[PDB]
Structure 1
Amino acid sequence: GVLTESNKKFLPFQQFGRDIADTTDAVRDPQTLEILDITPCSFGGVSVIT
């Protein structure tokens, strides 16, 4: 995905993060202890117009 810098705040023991759909949504940085969002890249079909 695109590791966008996050906005929300983790509890200072929580590593993972997920959504109502129960899939990976945010990740705390193991080194600098920062939180990052996630946004996958699968973007739509491709149609022709003639």
Structure 2
Amino acid sequence: KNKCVNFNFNGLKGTGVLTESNKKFLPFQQFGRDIADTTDAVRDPQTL
């Protein structure tokens, strides 16, 4: 966390900084998108 690392999240590969989210996903939601279909947030499959 708080470091640029190559992450493979549930089959999603990318590079960036992982930080605690301040946006409240609803229980059924498990993946967020920004403008232009850019992954902005995601929940941990092992800890949710």
Both proteins in one fold, TM over 0.5 = yes
Name the count of aligned residue pairs: 33
Percent of residue pairs bearing the same amino acid type: 100
Q: Which residue of 2 aligns with 1:22?
A: 37
Superposed CA RMSD: 1.0
State the TM-score, normalizing by the size of structure 2: 0.58
| Greater per-residue strand proportion | 2
State the TM-score, normalizing by the size of structure 1: 0.56
Runs (4+) off by over 3 Å? none
Structure number with bigger Rg: 1
